[PDB]
Amino acid sequence: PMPPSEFLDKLMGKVSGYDARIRPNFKGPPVNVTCNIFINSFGSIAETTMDYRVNIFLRQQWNDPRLAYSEYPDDSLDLDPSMLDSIWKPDLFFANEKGANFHEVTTDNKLLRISKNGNVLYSIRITLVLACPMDLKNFPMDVQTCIMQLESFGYTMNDLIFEWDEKGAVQVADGLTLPQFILKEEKDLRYCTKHYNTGKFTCIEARFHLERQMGYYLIQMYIPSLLIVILSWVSFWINMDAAPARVGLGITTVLTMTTQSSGSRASLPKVSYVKAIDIWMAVCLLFVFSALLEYAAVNFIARQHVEEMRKLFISRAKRIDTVSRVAFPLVFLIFNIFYWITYKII
Amino acid sequence: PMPPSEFLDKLMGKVSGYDARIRPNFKGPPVNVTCNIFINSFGSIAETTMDYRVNIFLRQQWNDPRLAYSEYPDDSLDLDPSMLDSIWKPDLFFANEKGANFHEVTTDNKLLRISKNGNVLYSIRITLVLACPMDLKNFPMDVQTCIMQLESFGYTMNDLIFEWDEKGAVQVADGLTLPQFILKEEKDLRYCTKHYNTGKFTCIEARFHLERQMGYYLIQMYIPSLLIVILSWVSFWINMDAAPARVGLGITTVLTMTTQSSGSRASLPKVSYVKAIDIWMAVCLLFVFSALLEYAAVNFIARQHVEEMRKLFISRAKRIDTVSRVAFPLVFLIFNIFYWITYKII
Amino acid sequence: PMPPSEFLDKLMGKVSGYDARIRPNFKGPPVNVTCNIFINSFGSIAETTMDYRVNIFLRQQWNDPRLAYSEYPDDSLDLDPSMLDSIWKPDLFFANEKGANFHEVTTDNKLLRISKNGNVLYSIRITLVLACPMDLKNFPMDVQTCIMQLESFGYTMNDLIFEWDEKGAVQVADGLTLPQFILKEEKDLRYCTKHYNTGKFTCIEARFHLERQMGYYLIQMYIPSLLIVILSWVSFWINMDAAPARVGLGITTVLTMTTQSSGSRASLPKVSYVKAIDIWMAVCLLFVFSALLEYAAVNFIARQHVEEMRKLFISRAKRIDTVSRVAFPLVFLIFNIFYWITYKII
């Protein structure tokens, strides 16, 4: 018979009363649009900007009873995407876009198919840079919940309603891994219905739980800060009379821990609250600073000068050294028990 | 009866004398447009560039008596945003744009509805990168007032007048927080009417008060600079004869305070006036530099060499050391009283 | 006779029943499109972003029996690229685009020619920023396999099938070299057929093997880390009584190896697993840290003080020094044998 685009001339055209500016079931019940996404790419989760770039296939399904047909024999029509300006489409957008674009290389990456009863499937490829507020109270040991939410800009709740479908509403690609995070399989799917002075609008959203990887922040921050604290402990095995040696060891370790602490936050937002790497780098700064304050007590007691009272202060300044060769590895060992268990419960 | 877009053919079309190039009430009183905004996103407040990126819903309300209707029964018409090139719209712009764009993903994020008497509501989503001049006289302790202003480019004051509405002229989203700032609830709403040689044009503006967060700049700048000053004070408890120890402690502390002071301004505009962190990092540099100048007096008096006069200079060089073990923590303590009270009054 | 664009009016126009929205051999066998690419530019292989920018000529060949001709004498028609919106073209895209664009300077860089039997050749110039996941288990000694894959967005497998051609399916330009990598001549060409809930779609892909260049990472990372380890070995030829000399040499070498190790990963993704440069910079950090722990044993044994037992500890602390002048260059020499052979097998 007729070819389907020329059959769509009798379906999209001005004959038979079709207008692409009017929603289906007009002056009636609202349009029920059900949605699911397919995540191709995910990542580049920046924390200075507090955003993440995603690449999705946005699928939408509604029903247009004006687009029903019965003369054509087959069940679906793979229409050309240049004829998408002639149908009605919902005005979905993202409440946290922060910039987005289509993909237009070699063809607009768009998809249209219409069933016999008017069921319209519409899939497009979108790249989003979605804004999620980070919560960094325990920074290497945190779980982030970055969301994406899908709203309607022009049609209110009594005209257009978004839903998720009950058969896998968020699909993820096969080889989709992350360098810093892991993506949990459970995904929250709930409503986020927005109220304004204009009206109430539909909104659906999807939460993504991101658990980090411990292994990077151990190698750069935890292990080298653990070596400078041990480097301060060899001052106690050096002679007391070696005054430029034990002081110059105390200076250099207490001023690299300032450098290691400032470099721990170079790729972070400038948040005011204190985090788990900050209370590691402040207590590890306290051990290397109280080791140089130990020798200031050793150097002050030993100068107190009868040689019978002189033997008291030398044996006292050696008594304060034999205690600290055991006590400072012992207090730092029971700090590691209190630190890592607190951030393994959470 | 007729569908409303085809009813808008009898309302927007060339019949009944409607032209989308002519303002309403032409050859009459000026067009009164009232406006309010809704702030979705706010932040990325850069200081090197002195700007901030915002994401608003710009709502505009005017009256077009040509767009009145009485045959259609309902009170409003949710028209399609593709028919916005057929109505008259005001030429609002921003006097401090520095680049801006629309949002066009899956639909142009636009909104149109027309009342029965011709009241037109027009809402669009805009992303702005607005320029605000920073005032950094007291940099961690300042309050910034970054503005946005809304002008008319083509129509003068006798043709088009902007207003704010008297019912919440600036709304803010619910979970809108900032990493570095807090946004005060009181918002100034005043006029900024511009005069040129072309004419006088309407202008309305809105001030936003931004108070910082103290907790970031304490952890990175105030507390580590406070430790290097205390690190200079342990030189006084070291033996006077330890010449490479007390000098090498004075060198290393006075040359990391140069490093800490240059890093205090790495993310700042290159302003010439002196600020509150600069007079902290210069006085804290004065304590660590006058502690090494103290030992240059200790090392010079002790070399002055009868052994009866030799006992005078050693007891004098110990007299200058017992004073400075009390005096230098005392002067720095009464500087912290004068510093933090001065920047708590302001 | 007629000029070929006006002959294409009788070939592309609405006469003779040609529609540019309908695939060839409609209601029949699927469209067989064969493809080959020509790589002009290649490089800027970023590892923080894990992507690479390429510049290709994408050639596509199919058959449209509607575009056959017999009146015109010649075998091909170099048509103008402005008449490409009037023919049918396949909807090829890239599953790992991450942004791409056309080249439109002085003309849309496009090419069309049609044979007598309807064979259509279509070449365009595309710039792609293709995403490839890096595998950095042995980072200076790795081979990366970065792919590119070519899919169909709208037409399923029963409507459109992609192939490679059997005569050089990937060509490379003549003077195409890379600063960091070399491109192997063998290129894998296989299928990547994607299944969704929408349908199954065609996919072809091409693997590119990238072997690095050793010579950069030797000069910056391996050789300067090899000098600091040798710099720690001159402590054993310094007098034992020079306590600020041998300690201050141990401090400075063990705290620059922390700086050299953190700078080894400044241009890398924040991956958690350990790599070959990390186990070089951790063992080279172990030699410079166990050289300062050697002198802490030398300084502790020599202080143990009858002068007959005093001569035992001095000769014992010299015995531990004569061993380490041979043993520490010997263990580091047999570590270089185990390190470089392990990463020459792989």
Added chain:
Amino acid sequence: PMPPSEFLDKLMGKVSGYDARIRPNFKGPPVNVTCNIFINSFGSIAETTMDYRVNIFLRQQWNDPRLAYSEYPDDSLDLDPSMLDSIWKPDLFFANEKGANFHEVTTDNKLLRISKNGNVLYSIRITLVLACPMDLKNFPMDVQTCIMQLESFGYTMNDLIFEWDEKGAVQVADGLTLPQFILKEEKDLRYCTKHYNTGKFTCIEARFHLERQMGYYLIQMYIPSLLIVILSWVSFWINMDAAPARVGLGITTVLTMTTQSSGSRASLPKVSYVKAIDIWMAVCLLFVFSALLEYAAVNFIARQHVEEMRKLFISRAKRIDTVSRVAFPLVFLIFNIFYWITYKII
């Protein structure tokens, strides 16, 4: 009578012989266009790129005798900017664009009004990133003259002539300040007429004089380099026998002045000639390097060893120390007189 856009149908349309492709007074005298600009924003004056971003209102005034009217009563017509593709406009451009764009948010920011005799006023908002070659012979003490020039691309001198108007040809906004510079009120306005092999074209330009702010470069570069030179002078008040103290003070000050000198040019173009901060940082490097060479003479004379000749070399090595405690602050004081007066004359 008729509304003015429909009156412009009888003025812009194909009736009465109006063509928007033909300049006014065709086959006659050239078109005299007079221009003035209004600078909204100014700044972001980069020196690595040697450019500056400006935001102007470009106003143009010419006369089109085809656009004269006498039936309409008023003196001017605020026409809609969508009807700007129907009039003739001059082809003004900028010879140092380096990228530029229009402003299109909520309306194309354009302005058109036509007088009764045909005088056409045309104002648009443009953002420019204008290229100006920096002259950095005396870098903190320089005055830069960054220009902007306005040419014609298609029409030669015998068809179109640009002028400035004699009533304020460059206006500046009220609160327009700069963080690093000040903008002088005197602005040069002269001709820059370009000759090619195509023809001679009109050109007008406007010079802007930019004087810097001294106060930033004192705080970061001049004052901390002045402290390290004073820090070298305390070596002369330390005992001569303190060999690791006076040498280790000479090493650390001469190797931070290398760091301070390299950081003085991190935000600069890589120019080959020597500038005023380079001859400050090289002479201040000469004082801290000749202070360590002073102790190498003190340490060499004092080792020359009858004890009667031994008392000669110790008193000679103390004679060379008492001179340098006065001479080195004296030579550096008379260098500051010669340095700052030379760069206050210029």
Added chain:
Amino acid sequence: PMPPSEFLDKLMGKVSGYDARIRPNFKGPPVNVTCNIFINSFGSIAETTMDYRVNIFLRQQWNDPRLAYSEYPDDSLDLDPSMLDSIWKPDLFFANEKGANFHEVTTDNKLLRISKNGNVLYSIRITLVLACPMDLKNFPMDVQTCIMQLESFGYTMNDLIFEWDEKGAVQVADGLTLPQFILKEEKDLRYCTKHYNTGKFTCIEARFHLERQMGYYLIQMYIPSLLIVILSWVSFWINMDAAPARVGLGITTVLTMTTQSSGSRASLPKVSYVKAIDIWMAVCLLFVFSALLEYAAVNFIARQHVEEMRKLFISRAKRIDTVSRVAFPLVFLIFNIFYWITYKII
């Protein structure tokens, strides 16, 4: 008579058989297009990216015998650039674009004029970011040859041929200087004809020779590395018994030369071969490392301890010091002769 745009209606229109999709002299000899460029801007020659941004006027001259006229009296027609979609233009592009754009501010910066015999002149303004592979075998002493090449995408050699003109085929603006380079006046102009499997296409190219400026890399890299080598030579004038002084001078100079060497390649591509600054920074690292190895021989010989044999080792360890006070400035002086003459021949 008729105005020339309306005369161009009888010249460009569908009357008299003109089609803008067909090349001139069709079914005949190929179209000879001659070209010349005018370089407005040049620079921003990045080396990490290995590209350079240029701003040219691209002029093209061909002959269209369909566009000849004899009724109109004058010799040329300055046509409006909006009528450029109605003529035939060659499909010139650049084989190393890496992104490019037009300039569209206030008018498309385009130019068209047609002689009486049909000679068409066509000039446009283009900004290019052209890719040139750097050759950095002798990096501060190199001459770079960065090219640009102009090809045809659709028309082969038998349809369209590019040429340069014999009267100044590349012009350069007057005040066009570079911060890092100088541009030689001799410019190579040759052919680059490309062969594919599609066909053979025309190509012309132009080489630009860029000689650097020595004066920047002396101030930052050569002179400060020359001071650290001299700084190592003052160790020989310090007492042998000053063990923390001569060792601590050897440590600090040998670990800043690692810092100076890594900073010599921070703005470079990661190339594997060795360059002229690398063999400067490796030999200058060899002098500062063999000066600390000198004192390890001084400190080891002097410890060898009858006092008659004790006077032998002290006089031997002073003999090895008097040689090196002459020998090390002598070997470094004859290295500067061999280094700078080798890179003055090339």
